[PDB]
Amino acid sequence: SNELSKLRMRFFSALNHTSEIDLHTLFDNLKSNLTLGSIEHLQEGSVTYAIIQELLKGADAQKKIESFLKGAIKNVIHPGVIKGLTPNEINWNVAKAYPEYYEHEKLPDVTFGGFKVRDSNEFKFKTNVQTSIWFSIKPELFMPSKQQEALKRRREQYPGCKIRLIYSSSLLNPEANRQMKAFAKKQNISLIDIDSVKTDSPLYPLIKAELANLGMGGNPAAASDLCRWIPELFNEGFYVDIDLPVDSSKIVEGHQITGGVPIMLNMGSIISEPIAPHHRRQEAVCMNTDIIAYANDRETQVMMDTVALHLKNIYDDPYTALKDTPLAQTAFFNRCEEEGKNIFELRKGLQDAFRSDSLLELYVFLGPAKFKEVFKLKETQIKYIDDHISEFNEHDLLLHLISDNLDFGRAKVMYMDIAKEHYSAFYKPLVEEISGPGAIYNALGGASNFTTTHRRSTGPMLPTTPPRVLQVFCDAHDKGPFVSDNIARWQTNVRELSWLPS
Numbered sequence: 330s331n332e333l334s335k336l337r338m339r340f341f342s343a344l345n346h347t348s349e350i351d352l353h354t355l356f357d358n359l360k361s362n363l364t365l366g367s368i369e370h371l372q373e374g375s376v377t378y379a380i381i382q383e384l385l386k387g388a389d390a391q392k393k394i395e396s397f398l399k400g401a402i403k404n405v406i407h408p409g410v411i412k413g414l415t416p417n418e419i420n421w422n423v424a425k426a427y428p429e430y431y432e433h434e435k436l437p438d439v440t441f442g443g444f445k446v447r448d449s450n451e452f453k454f455k456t457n458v459q460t461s462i463w464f465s466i467k468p469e470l471f472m473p474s475k476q477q478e479a480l481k482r483r484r485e486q487y488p489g490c491k492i493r494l495i496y497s498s499s500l501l502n503p504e505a506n507r508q509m510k511a512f513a514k515k516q517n518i519s520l521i522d523i524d525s526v527k528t529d530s531p532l533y534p535l536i537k538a539e540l541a542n543l544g545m546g547g548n549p550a551a552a553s554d555l556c557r558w559i560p561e562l563f564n565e566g567f568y569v570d571i572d573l574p575v576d577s578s579k580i581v582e583g584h585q586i587t588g589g590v591p592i593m594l595n596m597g598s599i600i601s602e603p604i605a606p607h608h609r610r611q612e613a614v615c616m617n618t619d620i621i622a623y624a625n626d627r628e629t630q631v632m633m634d635t636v637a638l639h640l641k642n643i644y645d646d647p648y649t650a651l652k653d654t655p656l657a658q659t660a661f662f663n664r665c666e667e668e669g670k671n672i673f674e675l676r677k678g679l680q681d682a683f684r685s686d687s688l689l690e691l692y693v694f695l696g697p698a699k700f701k702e703v704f705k706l707k708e709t710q711i712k713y714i715d716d717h718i719s720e721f722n723e724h725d726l727l728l729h730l731i732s733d734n735l736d737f738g739r740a741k742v743m744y745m746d747i748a749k750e751h752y753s754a755f756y757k758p759l760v761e762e763i764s765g766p767g768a769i770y771n772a773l774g775g776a777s778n779f780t781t782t783h784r785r786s787t788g789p790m791l792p793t794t795p796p797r798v799l800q801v802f803c804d805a806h807d808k809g810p811f812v813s814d815n816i817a818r819w820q821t822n823v824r825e826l827s828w829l830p831s
């Protein structure tokens with residue numbers, strides 16, 4: 330009866346302590362069927378709240394509001410709270426259930442990974458089953474302290490979750506592997522050795538190659554990226570970057586959320602500057618793969634395979650995926666493409682060029698156009714160099730850079746450092762557009778498909794435009810208990826690395 334008093338207090342707050350009706354008798358008439366969980370969906374900002382405010386202005390409001398709430402609670406809100414529905418999702422379900430009280434548009438047709446997004450709430454996701462991945466580039470170290478501590482932290486902050494960890498035993502020496510096994514079974518972590526997994530995925534040999542090629546153009550984050558689209562590895566729960574903190578205040582009582590597609594990702598959006606021809610801003614949905622939720626459903630494998638086939642296509646021919654990256658503007662890239670060098674040779678060659686400490690090698694790598702841009706040379710200046718490059722030694726090239734603008738050793742370092750600060754921009758797309766969030770965004774439908782002219786609405790958010798549909802039904806970040814600031818939040822105005830090889 331403190332329990333009753335608490336419930337009563339929440340109800341009176343939720344409904345704004347109004348006296349245009351008698352909240353005492355309303356409460357008393359709903360309390361047989363009123364839980365704390367339900368009251369959240371009666372608060373200002375809710376669809377249910379908005380209807381109450383309109384009913385208040387009318388005759389017979391006491392009775393009309395009671396019968397509205399009795400049904401809305403029993404038929405819509407309570408079942409939705411139990412099911413793991415969000416406030417957004419319950420708001421839409423209330424609007425749909427009461428068109429006489431809430432005017433609203435149809436669910437727009439939005440496709441996402443070849444699936445039409447639904448509002449049925451039918452795909453279900455476990456928040457208590459979580460899988461992370463650590464592939465070590467140092468055979469002596471199973472996992473650094475930071476990653477170990479993150480895992481310990483999660484077990485405590487989540488306090489009965491099931492943690493699975495994918496790793497590679499062949500990347501570790503025998504003592505490191507002994508340490509890994511001790512760590513996992515001590516932490517009650519389920520270990521999965523990537524080295525010996527049974528699957529028909531075309532992504533499996535690609536993972537093995539990324540890892541086998543460490544030091545020769547392979548990348549451990551790219552391997553981790555790819556594992557996430559293999560059905561034998563991910564068929565329920567969440568993928569989460571090993572380093573993501575849990576926000577315990579976000580853990581839902583039933584350890585279950587729902588979605589309108591069978592695979593949800595971290596999402597947000599960016600509101601562009603005005604564009605032609607109406608000088609109007611566009612909202613472009615952005616996504617990230619640091620948090621992925623997988624439905625306990627057959628449709629999960631189907632959607633997963635669409636993505637996997639796309640990833641396979643990219644690895645087979647990465648030059649198309651990379652066509653608008655800074656690296657695409659280089660002589661080296663154009664040669665690699667003619668030669669059909671693969672992704673590993675492409676990454677290793679970039680790495681080699683920036684390890685070279687040779688202005689001449691860098692010239693050959695960049696080609697005159699990019700070299701001109703990196704060194705801010707006039708057209709006539711690059712023309713002279715390029716006409717005579719076959720005659721130059723290193724000092725020759727440096728003397729020309731200097732005049733185009735007394736320690737030749739320090740000057741060399743200065744110019745080398747100027748080039749080096751482009752390395753990151755050249756390299757990152759060789760993962761992000763190949764296995765990472767860029768490739769995945771494209772596999773799920775691409776820029777076009779996820780951009781629309783920015784519309785801002787009145788009152789409670791409903792899934793009535795494409796980005797709203799994605800925000801309401803497809804975003805694993807806001808529904809799950811994991812924290813990430815890796816991408817923009819939803820509706821962010823455009824105006825507001827462990828895996829980079831040294």
Ligand SMILES: O=c1ccn([C@@H]2O[C@H](COP(=O)(O)OP(=O)(O)O[C@H]3O[C@H](CO)[C@@H](O)[C@H](O)[C@H]3O)[C@@H](O)[C@H]2O)c(=O)[nH]1
Pocket residue numbers: 461462463464465466549550551553554570571572617618619620760761764765766815826827828
């Ligand atoms: O030595 C390493 C370094 C990274 N990783 C894996 O790669 C992931 C991402 O590493 P992180 O240092 O977090 O890189 P970020 O740039 O923050 O990660 C972003 O970019 C990566 C590359 O596409 C994706 O794997 C991530 O999900 C995405 O959040 C890690 O969680 C691990 O799974 C390893 O396994 N071994």
Ligand SMILES: [Mg+2]
Pocket residue numbers: 570572
């Ligand atoms: Mg990270």
